[PDB]
């Protein structure tokens, strides 16, 4: 039947789709990206200075594993993704709204870069054959910043799972990343870290799959 939503919810709901459309729009704009890395596995990391946001990172990786498996392992079981991933210490779902959107507190581990956590809303939609994780830093007053860890913010961040052009057994994972670490960190160093952060996620992801 019909369900009703508090204005605060609808707020998060909007954000859940504002983050999605804007991140997809950054992928729709195909050509224009520079290149940051090129792996032995054919893994790629593109970059671009978006007017609205700023310098973003686009991870180009394909995996020799079923798509739906990556789904449950990446979202349905994301709370425990802190196990097979060193770059993250603890991820906790603060609240689920409706079917797609939900707010999370992602606490990532640091040794020259100070520890940083995140409180963001994220939408897990799928047009059937293609699943996609959206998200962006949200304001969850019911979980303010704690002493010790610095609250960094996420820009329009998406992640697309697409069955291989000619192989259902394979999946093309496209991960557009946008973050504002919000430290005093130099401009240069921020680039390489966010890049390797992506290349690492790809590695650990493949390893978990086994």
Decide if 73 contacts 83 (C-beta within 8 A): no
Q: How far apart are CA 41 and CA 144, in angstroms?
A: 40
DSSP secondary structure letters along 41-57: TS-EEEEEE-SSS-EEE
Enumerate helices (H) and strands (E) in the chain, giving the number of each. Answer: 3, 13
CB atoms closer than 10 angstroms to residue 161: 24
State how far the Cα of 19 lies from the Cα of 80, in Å rounded to an integer. 24
146: DSSP letter: P
Given the structure tokens 């990172």, which residue do they identify? Answer: 57
Domain boundary assignment for the chain: 1-210
| Resolution of the experimentally solved model in angstroms | 3.4
Which residue do the tokens 């496209």 mark? Answer: 174
What is the C-alpha separation between 56 and 50, in angstroms, rounded?
A: 7
Phi, psi of 30 (to 5 degrees): -55, -80
Which run of H or E residues covers position 168?
strand 167-177
Report d(CA 85, CA 201) in Å as an integer. Answer: 7
Asked whether 52 and 172 are in contact (CB, 8 A), the reply is: no
From the list 65, 73, 76, the residue with the least C-alpha distance to 99 is 76
Q: Answer whether 23's CB lies under 8 Å from 176's CB.
A: yes
Distance between CA atoms of residues 129 and 120, nearest Å: 26
Structure tokens at 26: 């950054």
Please give the method by which this entry was determined.
Answer: X-ray
> What's the rounded Cα separation, in Å, for the pair 204 and 195?
15
| CATH number, span 1-210 | 3.30.530.20
Alpha-carbon distance of 81 to 59, in angstroms, equals: 18
The residue whose two tokens read 């789904």 is 71
| Distance separating alpha carbons of residues 151 and 118, to the nearest angstrom | 6
Q: Report the distance separating Cα 145 and Cα 107, nearest Å.
A: 11
Cβ–Cβ under 8 Å, residues 164 and 62: yes
The DSSP line for 71-136 is HIIIIITGGGTTTS-TT-SEEEEEEE-SSSEEEEEEEE----S--EEEEEEEEEEE-SS-EEE--E
- Residue 131's φ and ψ, nearest 5 degrees, are -100, 150
Angle, CA of 183, 160 and 15, to the nearest 5°: 60
């Amino acid at each position: 039947s019909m369900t009703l939503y508090s204005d605060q919810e609808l707020a998060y709901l909007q954000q859940g789709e504002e983050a999605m459309q804007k991140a997809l729009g950054i992928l729709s704009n195909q050509e224009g990206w520079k290149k940051e890395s090129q792996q032995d596995n054919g893994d790629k990391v593109m970059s671009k200075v978006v007017p609205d946001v700023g310098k973003v990172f686009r991870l180009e990786v394909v995996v020799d594993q079923p798509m739906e498996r990556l789904y449950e392992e990446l979202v349905e079981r994301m709370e425990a993704m802190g196990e097979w991933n060193p770059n993250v210490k603890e991820i906790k779902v603060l609240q689920k709204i409706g079917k797609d959107t939900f707010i999370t507190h992602e606490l990532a581990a640091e040794n020259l870069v100070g520890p940083r956590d995140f409180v963001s809303v994220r939408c897990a939609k799928r047009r059937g054959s293609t699943c996609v994780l959206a998200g962006m830093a949200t304001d969850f007053g019911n979980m303010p910043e704690q002493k010790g860890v610095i609250r960094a913010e996420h820009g329009p961040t998406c992640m697309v799972l697409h069955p291989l052009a000619g192989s259902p057994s394979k999946t093309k994972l496209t991960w557009l990343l946008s973050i504002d670490l919000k430290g005093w960190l130099p401009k240069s160093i921020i680039n390489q870290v966010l890049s390797q952060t992506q290349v690492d996620f790809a590695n650990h992801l493949r390893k978990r799959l086994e």
